């Protein structure tokens, strides 16, 4: 981190050099509030999880693929045939629809096809794997720092992006809970109480979802996308829009869950806004 | 012959079986040796889930081969 001999426009263009190398739809940067050039320039963008020491990665020996049609992928009309859907143990509907959007009735866990499946990459049940489709604008908010807004229309259920970063153990995460400014990038992989144990930190590496700001009335939510259905320790943290989003609307998600029956000031301005995200 | 079934925990169960043992028989043996009901067993070999009707020989499972057991869950 030198960035002292770099000017305003030089720093902004360096950050945009980082952005233009991001895989997929373009990610851009605008500032309509203050004269800050860009977010921290030490940050490096990554396209997938960066596991660290002491993080047991998914063992592929416990992974099993379906044998649905290789041409058209698995058919959403016949979910019983799909072997990698026999783990939900319910009416057993595919998480997505024909249009690739998650269903409004689908639960919080997504079971997707893996390498062992015979279906192609165009399979209807590989939405998170295919990657981002929405161009996102990183913009300076007025009371929350940087944030992300969408540029094109996104219907409810549309996939957005994965929360990426360094996957670290509970010990390493407990060592780096320095939040030295109301600044936190720790996302606990606490979707399953029986596994947990891991946390994705976006402080130094991560995705554009790292700029997603908390809201007590969000428009997007987080889903656990699973490719090795056996393992529940490491999995994709996919962001899906649960509300219809117009262009230029900031993408926000709740930093916690419903938790019913069980900086520090929140500047989201919601009707149900408790003054702290505590997250 | 002998085969080994590995759990996500790291437990290694030893089974005495034959190539003609059905996957149902293997699940019953797993139940006897560990108390895991067959309905919540998921035996996996070579990236594919083992089916009840077939035998170990059908899946080309020889001696001292390794099967992997995923305990089925419903509500996460």
């Amino acid at each position: 981190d030198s960035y002292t001999h770099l000017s305003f426009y030089e720093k902004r263009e360096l950050f945009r050099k980082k952005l233009r190398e991001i895989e997929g739809p373009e990610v851009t940067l605008v500032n309509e509030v203050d004269d800050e050039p860009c977010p921290s320039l030490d940050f490096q963008f990554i396209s997938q999880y960066r596991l660290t020491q002491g993080v047991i990665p998914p063992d592929p020996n416990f992974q099993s693929g379906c044998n649905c049609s290789s041409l058209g992928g698995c058919d959403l009309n016949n979910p019983s045939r799909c072997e990698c859907l026999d783990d939900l143990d319910e009416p057993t509907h595919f998480a997505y629809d024909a249009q690739g959007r998650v269903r409004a009735d689908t639960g919080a866990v997504i079971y997707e096809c893996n390498s062992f499946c015979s279906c192609s990459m165009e399979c209807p049940n590989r939405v998170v794997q295919r990657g981002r489709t929405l161009p996102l604008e990183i913009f300076k908010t007025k009371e929350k720092g940087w944030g992300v807004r969408s540029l094109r229309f996104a219907p409810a259920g549309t996939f957005i992006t994965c929360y990426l970063g360094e996957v670290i153990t509970s010990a390493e995460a407990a060592k780096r809970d320095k939040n030295d400014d109301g600044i936190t990038y720790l996302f606990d992989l606490d979707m399953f109480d029986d596994a947990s144990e891991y946390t994705v930190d976006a402080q130094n590496y991560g995705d554009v979802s790292r700029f997603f700001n908390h809201s007590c009335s969000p428009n997007i939510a987080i889903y656990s996308a699973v490719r090795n259905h056996g393992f529940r320790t490491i999995y994709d943290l996919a962001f899906f829009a649960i509300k219809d989003i117009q262009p230029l609307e900031e993408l926000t998600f709740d930093y916690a869950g419903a938790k019913d029956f069980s900086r520090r000031q929140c500047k989201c301005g919601s009707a149900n806004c408790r003054g702290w995200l505590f997250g | 012959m002998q085969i080994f079934v590995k759990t996500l925990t790291g437990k290694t169960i030893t089974l005495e079986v034959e190539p003609s043992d059905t996957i149902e028989n293997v699940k019953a043996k797993i139940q006897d040796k560990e108390g895991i009901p067959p309905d919540q067993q998921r035996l996996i070999f070579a990236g594919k889930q083992l089916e009840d009707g077939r035998t170990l020989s059908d899946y080309n499972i020889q001696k001292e081969s390794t099967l992997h057991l995923v305990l089925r869950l419903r509500g996460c």
Binding site: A104, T106, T184, D190, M191, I222, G257 | -
Partner: peptide, 14 residues
């Protein structure tokens, strides 16, 4: 204590 959380799968997240 202050970390982003999925909130657990215990609620359906609908």
């Amino acid at each position: 204590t202050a970390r982003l959380s999925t909130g657990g799968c215990a609620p359906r997240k609908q």
